[PDB]
Amino acid sequence: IKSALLVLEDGTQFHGRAIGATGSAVGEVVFNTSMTGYQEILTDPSYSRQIVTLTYPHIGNVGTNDADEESSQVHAQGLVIRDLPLIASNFRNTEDLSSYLKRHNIVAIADIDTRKLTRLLREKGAQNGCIIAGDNPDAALALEKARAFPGLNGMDLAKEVTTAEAYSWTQGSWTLTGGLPQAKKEDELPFHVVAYDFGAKRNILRMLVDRGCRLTIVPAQTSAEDVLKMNPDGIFLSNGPGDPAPCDYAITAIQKFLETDIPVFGICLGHQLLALASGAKTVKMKFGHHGGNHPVKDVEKNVVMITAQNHGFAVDEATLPANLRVTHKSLFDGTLQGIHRTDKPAFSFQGHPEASPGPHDAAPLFDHFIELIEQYRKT
Amino acid sequence: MPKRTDIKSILILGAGPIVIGQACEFDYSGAQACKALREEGYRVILVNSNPATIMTDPEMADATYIEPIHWEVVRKIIEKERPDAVLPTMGGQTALNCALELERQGVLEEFGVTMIGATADAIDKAEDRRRFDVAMKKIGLETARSGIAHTMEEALAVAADVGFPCIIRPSFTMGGSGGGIAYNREEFEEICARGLDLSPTKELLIDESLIGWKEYEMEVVRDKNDNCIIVCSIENFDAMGIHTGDSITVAPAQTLTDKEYQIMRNASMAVLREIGVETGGSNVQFAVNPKNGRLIVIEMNPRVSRSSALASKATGFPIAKVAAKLAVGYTLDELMNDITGGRTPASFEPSIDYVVTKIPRFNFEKFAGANDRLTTQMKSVGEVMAIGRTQQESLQKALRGLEVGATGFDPKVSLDDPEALTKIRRELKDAGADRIWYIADAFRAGLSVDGVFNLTNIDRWFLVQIEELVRLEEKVAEVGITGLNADFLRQLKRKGFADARLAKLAGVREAEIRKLRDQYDLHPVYKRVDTCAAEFATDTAYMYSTYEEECEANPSTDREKIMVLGGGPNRIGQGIEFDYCCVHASLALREDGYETIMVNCNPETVSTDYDTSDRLYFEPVTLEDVLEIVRIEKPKGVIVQYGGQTPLKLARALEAAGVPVIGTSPDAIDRAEDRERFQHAVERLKLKQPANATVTAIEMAVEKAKEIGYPLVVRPSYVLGGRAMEIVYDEADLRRYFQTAVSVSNDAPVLLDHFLDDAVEVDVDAICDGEMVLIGGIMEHIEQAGVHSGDSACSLPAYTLSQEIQDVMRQQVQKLAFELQVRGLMNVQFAVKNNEVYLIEVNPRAARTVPFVSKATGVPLAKVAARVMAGKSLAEQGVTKEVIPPYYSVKEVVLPFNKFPGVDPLLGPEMRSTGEVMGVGRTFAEAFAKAQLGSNSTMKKHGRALLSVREGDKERVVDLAAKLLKQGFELDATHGTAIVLGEAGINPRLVNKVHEGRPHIQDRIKNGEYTYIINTTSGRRAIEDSRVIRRSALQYKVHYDTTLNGGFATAMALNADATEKVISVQEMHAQIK
Ligand SMILES: Nc1ncnc2c1ncn2[C@@H]1O[C@H](COP(=O)(O)OP(=O)(O)NP(=O)(O)O)[C@@H](O)[C@H]1O
Ligand SMILES: Nc1ncnc2c1ncn2[C@@H]1O[C@H](COP(=O)(O)OP(=O)(O)NP(=O)(O)O)[C@@H](O)[C@H]1O
Ligand SMILES: CC[N+](CC)(CC)CC
Ligand SMILES: NCCC[C@H](N)C(=O)O
Ligand SMILES: [Cl-]
Ligand SMILES: [Cl-]
Ligand SMILES: [Cl-]
Ligand SMILES: [Cl-]
Ligand SMILES: [K+]
Ligand SMILES: [K+]
Ligand SMILES: [K+]
Ligand SMILES: [K+]
Ligand SMILES: [Mn+2]
Ligand SMILES: [Mn+2]
Ligand SMILES: [Mn+2]
């Protein structure tokens, strides 16, 4: 018998079973309502320093596969589930969940009341916690480490997960029939996008490439100047972990891009950054949005779309600069989900148009971006 | 826009009598719509022949019509109610089909009725197989290698194409009706023959084989703004090849990666869009090749389905309610999510933090010579649903919630039976209703998961789970009661193990495990259903039990509670009537100020609706499960009289365990339920009962039989629906059916009752408050005693019985009510022979005739009796005098013989009907004709009639023959009948039996020579001799009667017009003074 234990800042204990690597894990604990796409969720960089709790009891039913990786590694700090299936049963499976977690050296616990945990977080808001998996896990030590957690509030995580050297991406999206395609030749890509890497999901890139862009990924801290110098047909601002607030560099630079006529697009963090760069304010939500069933309204067309969400922070609507016009809102809590510059060719989305995992509903948000780009090209 | 202006009045098309493949789902659906609209300021008019439904409650809709669901009849309703729109999507196939014929016949057009929810083209687009297929290809979805057939010659050629095995699927049918798996040529013609005839469009869709692929369904809802959502996804346990309705299924889907889900999801939406569904919800089914994710579209249902009900109960998402509203132009974003206290919009996709399991409920034991292998045509009669935090937990609960005697995985074969692996093999290879239990037996027997997968095609994801429970079970067996430490016991409770299963394994008493649990403090917690996985709070109390940490029960201390125990899955003999009563008891008491708690796990019910009671425990109706809730609810009282045989059997145990049982006592119930005890009561009362004896063993039975004399009726204790009941003609008839009678007798004796020949059967429903007895109604049966009350047609008032004799019965009822200590409802059964009242039995509870009588008398008996049970007397309620309506009311039943062809469609002491209809008339004749038509009888007012009667009926046959002649029929008869008729002066046309020559009856019936068939038999052998007329009459769709009284009634009906006049229930009730 292999123990594990999860302790919340508030002193609440969850005793269960160890399902991943031996050791401890500390982070901000979050709940995710997705019924499918746990692997994609795990390899999502925005989860860095976060201990992810899944609401759907059985996690690992389909095993894992490389195509289902949204990044080169597992970003989640920890994994909290109700039940780890006996077997993985899917033709796409290459490695059972346990193995995978261990391999990625992830501390993970199973067999706990995730529902009670969910209700707690939803009720009393996000909390930091600690998971200790091993022989005799020390509940007081766990608490200590949890308590000692700093807090993603004011935590710039973007810098921590970003790429070292800028790079090129020309790879398209996955197909059932073909799987992950072969990278394309630059010449096959009309458009040329520059992407800030704030801890970006591969699906963003693929979907872009999918729409005719040849990409160049750059570190979060890259200078607008350095940027402009490549003559990009459009710029893009990825998703990523932590507080967007603290990221002055990127803020600064974005400000610098909005002086020019280049089209710009921000997803999630990028959304927050751009809103920041537009003089808007960002807040940290009670528990945030994490799932794949989130209704979002395109206020403009008065059309609803089910989306993939993952965000602990948000942009304050009642502090929005006039130049900032609301394109979208959440139908669950009326939060701000999308914005557009009145003056510029810059807009953003709070959720994930790229899904992975999740509904494909918001993928057209990309198309806008392509419109904006072919237009600047006409120019 | 918001809700529509040009529409004020809506006509909701009901689904008719419950039949296999088309059951309670719609009453649930129908009733949802009704409430939805009405809550929305709309005039609601609805038509439904079924009296047992809630939807036909006069207080449910503005205009309620209990009329035959015939376009001519529906016509007259339109004509009279001048409805604006018509909602034809909440009544299954009956409704779609009718909506379409109204349309065809230009009736809609004729009166300006707008078709809402779904248009006629959309409907056809999906209902039509060729069309559907064509759409699939147009939107690039894949379907199974097929072809369309309009003929046999054409079906042959497509079969010679796709190959065997092949899948037959007619257009405009559901429940796999008229379909099946052709594994050869012989099978092929028989199936196609049936489908082509069955098809409204005379069209079959023939497919290649996808047998063994995974099977999935998705429930989608689409609005006028084009908003689209997946309400629920479902993964089938049983693979492609076994109709979803006959399969164990779970929600949500379990073995798809996000990538496959999305594909499936997109396809689902693509499909609704392509077909034209804009203002509702539909079900899209798919097949998946486990080996490669290859997706294939199976079909679409442009209406609500049985999965919608299940899907609804599974997520807390009110499908039918929403859809209704959507049909009047409401949009998803507009609509609030019920359960989250309207905190969120209905436009979202539900997320659940538990596992839902549904298992079908069968009744193969009632249909001996039937093929009991599961296939593409539905055979089940009901379904149970369970919720658990884990699949194991979910599954086990469902097993015990099914009410088939299982505690969970009880063994089917012995471990020390040489032939055991062979039986297992078979059962696995060729699924029967018993498969799940055999799968466990296979693990006990040494078969591997792989070995099982190969035979079953059931995903290993499920299999390993069952193997693990088996291993845990073997441990319990080894360690025994001593090994039941808290840790282990706790682990066991968590995997769904029932105290009862643990008990058998540990070779102890269930009460011992429960005690042990007590010691340990091992009790379950209650979670709530909320549509969102706890993302938001809910103020609704829709809960399920689980063994975890946190409890969300939060019980009131505030009020006096009343617990109502539900009937579990529907089944022959115990159906919707019992739901209707439960719903009413809650409605009543609640209104009276009590906090009402419902315990039930039938998803297709209104009782399992969160609007219905204060509290809802979606749990198996077992002793263990009920005790736990009681433990926490601490109710004022519990009602065990409104949910069938179940809670009835639990009574003693409950009371004994401290449960506060209200209404008729457990001892009292036992006086009535135990045949020997009942027998005494009759004696002590100086009442008349046949010559009989109560017995426990054959030899003695045999001996006693000699005494009583044959023929004789074998009646077990503690059964309803005539389970295992049989008329015995001799010793050996006896030895053959005796054990079976005992096996179902509940440690109570089996009655041996002398058969009462040429006697009239009577049912009496009454209420006793200990002070007074209120007679609800006396119903005289058409078919004689010997034909189960549930299978007989009946009249209210009686149509032939003297007042003098009825009065004799009213008194016996009262005498009995009082002696037996009845408190609430009771149902009394009598037989009239020679102007002599005979007592057959007493049902110490609400009976299946209750809803009908209520509807007929305008008195809500379930409500009244519920109040009496809770303390309020009849006097106090002011319900003290028996009502005798001004009109006639006739009940007729619908039988499933057409689903089980290898069965002799004979009537008897054991109930086999699945549903019923109500006929209301100015006369008995008018009532009957209406009943007969609504029962979907093929009877004509002219043609040739075939007469083939038994000896006893040789006297009244003349009168019957005569009557047919005066009507313009032309007669044919067989030998003996012809002789008698000849002697009367009636000269039928001679017809050759099958052994007599050619052409014979079969030939002539088969040729379509006849429009009516009257065939009566007597005796085991003479029955088996005439089986072919019956089977052929059925196959060829000719109205047939198997009782002379039946024939006489038919005859009368000939002098009436069921389409003549229509009347609302409101209006019927108003005619009562
Ligand atoms: N190609 C095929 N191979 C094997 N099995 C099949 C195939 N097509 C269908 N089936 C099975 O046949 C069943 C019935 O098909 P279906 O189209 O749902 O009939 P239906 O009568 O319209 N259903 P319903 O309206 O819900 O009562 C399915 O549940 C499958 O298990
Ligand atoms: N002695 C008898 N003579 C003739 N017919 C009889 C006799 N006993 C019973 N029957 C027939 O057998 C049927 C079933 O007997 P019954 O005892 O009522 O069964 P049951 O299962 O308790 N029925 P129920 O509780 O109403 O669903 C009756 O409806 C009669 O048609
Ligand atoms: C579903 C019920 N029917 C087909 C629509 C057959 C009983 C109506 C007659
Ligand atoms: N109410 C019973 C149905 C009667 C059937 N037509 C037959 O006579 O057997
Ligand atoms: Cl816990
Ligand atoms: Cl294939
Ligand atoms: Cl142990
Ligand atoms: Cl059969
Ligand atoms: K635990
Ligand atoms: K199936
Ligand atoms: K269909
Ligand atoms: K009868
Ligand atoms: Mn269908
Ligand atoms: Mn009975
Ligand atoms: Mn009876």
Short mmCIF file of all heavy atoms in Angstrom, two decimals, chain B residues 514-535:
data_model
loop_
_atom_site.label_atom_id
_atom_site.label_comp_id
_atom_site.label_asym_id
_atom_site.label_seq_id
_atom_site.Cartn_x
_atom_site.Cartn_y
_atom_site.Cartn_z
N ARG B 514 -25.25 -5.35 8.12
CA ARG B 514 -25.77 -4.03 8.41
C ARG B 514 -25.40 -3.58 9.81
O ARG B 514 -25.03 -2.44 10.04
CB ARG B 514 -27.23 -3.94 8.07
CG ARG B 514 -27.92 -2.74 8.66
CD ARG B 514 -29.30 -2.61 8.07
NE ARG B 514 -30.29 -3.51 8.66
CZ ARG B 514 -30.73 -4.64 8.11
NH1 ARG B 514 -30.25 -5.13 6.96
NH2 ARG B 514 -31.67 -5.31 8.77
N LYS B 515 -25.43 -4.53 10.72
CA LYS B 515 -25.06 -4.33 12.11
C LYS B 515 -23.59 -3.99 12.18
O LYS B 515 -23.17 -3.08 12.89
CB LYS B 515 -25.31 -5.62 12.89
CG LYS B 515 -25.47 -5.47 14.40
CD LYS B 515 -24.29 -6.03 15.23
CE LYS B 515 -24.55 -7.40 15.89
NZ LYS B 515 -23.43 -7.90 16.75
N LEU B 516 -22.80 -4.79 11.48
CA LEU B 516 -21.37 -4.59 11.45
C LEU B 516 -21.07 -3.19 10.97
O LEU B 516 -20.22 -2.50 11.53
CB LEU B 516 -20.72 -5.64 10.54
CG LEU B 516 -19.28 -5.94 10.89
CD1 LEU B 516 -19.23 -6.81 12.13
CD2 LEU B 516 -18.62 -6.70 9.75
N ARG B 517 -21.80 -2.78 9.94
CA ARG B 517 -21.61 -1.45 9.40
C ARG B 517 -21.89 -0.41 10.46
O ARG B 517 -21.27 0.64 10.57
CB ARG B 517 -22.51 -1.21 8.19
CG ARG B 517 -21.83 -1.64 6.90
CD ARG B 517 -22.40 -0.93 5.69
NE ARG B 517 -23.83 -1.14 5.64
CZ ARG B 517 -24.72 -0.19 5.88
NH1 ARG B 517 -24.36 1.05 6.19
NH2 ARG B 517 -26.00 -0.49 5.83
N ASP B 518 -22.91 -0.71 11.22
CA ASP B 518 -23.27 0.18 12.27
C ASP B 518 -22.16 0.38 13.27
O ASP B 518 -21.89 1.48 13.75
CB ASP B 518 -24.48 -0.38 13.02
CG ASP B 518 -25.33 0.79 13.46
OD1 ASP B 518 -26.06 1.20 12.45
OD2 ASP B 518 -25.25 1.31 14.54
N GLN B 519 -21.63 -0.73 13.70
CA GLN B 519 -20.57 -0.76 14.67
C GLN B 519 -19.46 0.19 14.25
O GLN B 519 -19.11 1.12 14.97
CB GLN B 519 -20.05 -2.21 14.75
CG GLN B 519 -19.25 -2.54 16.02
CD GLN B 519 -18.39 -3.78 15.86
OE1 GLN B 519 -17.17 -3.76 16.12
NE2 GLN B 519 -19.03 -4.87 15.42
N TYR B 520 -18.99 -0.05 13.02
CA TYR B 520 -17.90 0.66 12.35
C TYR B 520 -18.11 2.14 12.00
O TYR B 520 -17.15 2.89 11.78
CB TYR B 520 -17.50 -0.09 11.06
CG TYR B 520 -16.94 -1.49 11.20
CD1 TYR B 520 -16.97 -2.38 10.12
CD2 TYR B 520 -16.33 -1.93 12.38
CE1 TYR B 520 -16.43 -3.66 10.20
CE2 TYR B 520 -15.79 -3.22 12.49
CZ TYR B 520 -15.84 -4.08 11.39
OH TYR B 520 -15.32 -5.34 11.48
N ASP B 521 -19.38 2.54 11.93
CA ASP B 521 -19.83 3.85 11.51
C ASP B 521 -19.75 4.00 9.99
O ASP B 521 -19.48 5.06 9.43
CB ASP B 521 -19.18 5.02 12.25
CG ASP B 521 -20.00 6.28 12.09
OD1 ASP B 521 -21.29 6.04 12.15
OD2 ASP B 521 -19.52 7.40 11.94
N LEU B 522 -20.01 2.88 9.32
CA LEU B 522 -19.96 2.74 7.88
C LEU B 522 -21.32 2.88 7.26
O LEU B 522 -22.10 1.92 7.17
CB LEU B 522 -19.27 1.40 7.56
CG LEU B 522 -18.84 1.13 6.12
CD1 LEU B 522 -18.07 2.32 5.54
CD2 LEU B 522 -17.94 -0.10 6.09
N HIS B 523 -21.55 4.14 6.91
CA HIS B 523 -22.73 4.62 6.25
C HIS B 523 -22.29 5.49 5.09
O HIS B 523 -21.22 6.11 5.14
CB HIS B 523 -23.62 5.45 7.19
CG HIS B 523 -23.92 4.71 8.45
ND1 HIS B 523 -25.00 3.86 8.55
CD2 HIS B 523 -23.27 4.71 9.63
CE1 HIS B 523 -25.00 3.38 9.78
NE2 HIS B 523 -23.97 3.87 10.46
N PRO B 524 -23.13 5.50 4.07
CA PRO B 524 -22.88 6.26 2.87
C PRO B 524 -23.16 7.72 3.12
O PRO B 524 -23.81 8.07 4.09
CB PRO B 524 -23.96 5.77 1.91
CG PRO B 524 -25.11 5.24 2.76
CD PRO B 524 -24.50 4.92 4.11
N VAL B 525 -22.69 8.56 2.20
CA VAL B 525 -22.94 9.99 2.19
C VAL B 525 -23.87 10.19 1.01
O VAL B 525 -24.00 9.28 0.19
CB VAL B 525 -21.66 10.78 1.99
CG1 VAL B 525 -20.84 10.57 3.24
CG2 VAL B 525 -20.88 10.28 0.78
N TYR B 526 -24.51 11.35 0.90
CA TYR B 526 -25.37 11.60 -0.25
C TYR B 526 -24.82 12.76 -1.07
O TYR B 526 -24.45 13.80 -0.54
CB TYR B 526 -26.88 11.76 0.12
CG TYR B 526 -27.49 10.47 0.61
CD1 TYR B 526 -27.32 10.07 1.94
CD2 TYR B 526 -28.17 9.62 -0.26
CE1 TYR B 526 -27.84 8.86 2.39
CE2 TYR B 526 -28.72 8.41 0.18
CZ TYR B 526 -28.54 8.03 1.51
OH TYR B 526 -29.09 6.86 1.97
N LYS B 527 -24.70 12.55 -2.38
CA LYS B 527 -24.25 13.60 -3.26
C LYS B 527 -25.45 14.14 -4.00
O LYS B 527 -26.54 13.56 -4.01
CB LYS B 527 -23.22 13.19 -4.27
CG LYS B 527 -22.00 12.55 -3.67
CD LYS B 527 -21.22 13.43 -2.71
CE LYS B 527 -19.90 12.78 -2.34
NZ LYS B 527 -18.97 13.65 -1.58
N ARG B 528 -25.27 15.27 -4.64
CA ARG B 528 -26.38 15.81 -5.38
C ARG B 528 -26.12 15.90 -6.84
O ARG B 528 -24.99 16.08 -7.26
CB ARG B 528 -26.76 17.19 -4.92
CG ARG B 528 -27.37 17.09 -3.55
CD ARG B 528 -27.83 18.43 -3.06
NE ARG B 528 -28.39 18.29 -1.73
CZ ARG B 528 -29.25 19.15 -1.23
NH1 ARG B 528 -29.65 20.21 -1.92
NH2 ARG B 528 -29.74 18.94 -0.01
N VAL B 529 -27.20 15.78 -7.61
CA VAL B 529 -27.11 15.93 -9.04
C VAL B 529 -27.18 17.44 -9.26
O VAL B 529 -27.98 18.11 -8.60
CB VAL B 529 -28.21 15.17 -9.80
CG1 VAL B 529 -28.28 15.65 -11.24
CG2 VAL B 529 -27.96 13.67 -9.79
N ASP B 530 -26.33 17.98 -10.13
CA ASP B 530 -26.29 19.43 -10.36
C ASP B 530 -25.98 19.93 -11.79
O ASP B 530 -25.85 21.13 -11.97
CB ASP B 530 -25.36 20.12 -9.35
CG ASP B 530 -23.94 19.64 -9.41
OD1 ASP B 530 -23.44 19.13 -10.40
OD2 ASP B 530 -23.29 19.84 -8.30
N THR B 531 -25.84 19.03 -12.79
CA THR B 531 -25.55 19.33 -14.20
C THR B 531 -24.15 19.86 -14.52
O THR B 531 -23.76 19.89 -15.70
CB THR B 531 -26.59 20.26 -14.89
OG1 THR B 531 -26.24 21.60 -14.65
CG2 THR B 531 -28.02 20.03 -14.44
N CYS B 532 -23.42 20.33 -13.48
CA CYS B 532 -22.11 20.98 -13.64
C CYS B 532 -20.90 20.45 -12.88
O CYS B 532 -19.87 21.12 -12.85
CB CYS B 532 -22.27 22.46 -13.24
SG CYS B 532 -22.86 22.63 -11.54
N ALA B 533 -20.98 19.29 -12.25
CA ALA B 533 -19.82 18.82 -11.53
C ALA B 533 -19.42 19.71 -10.33
O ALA B 533 -18.23 19.87 -10.05
CB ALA B 533 -18.67 18.58 -12.51
N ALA B 534 -20.40 20.27 -9.62
CA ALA B 534 -20.15 21.13 -8.46
C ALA B 534 -19.59 22.54 -8.76
O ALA B 534 -19.23 23.28 -7.84
CB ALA B 534 -19.34 20.39 -7.39
N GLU B 535 -19.50 22.93 -10.03
CA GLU B 535 -19.01 24.27 -10.36
C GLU B 535 -19.89 25.34 -9.77
O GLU B 535 -19.43 26.41 -9.45
CB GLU B 535 -18.85 24.48 -11.86
CG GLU B 535 -17.98 25.71 -12.16
CD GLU B 535 -17.32 25.74 -13.53
OE1 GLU B 535 -17.68 24.73 -14.31
OE2 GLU B 535 -16.53 26.61 -13.88
#
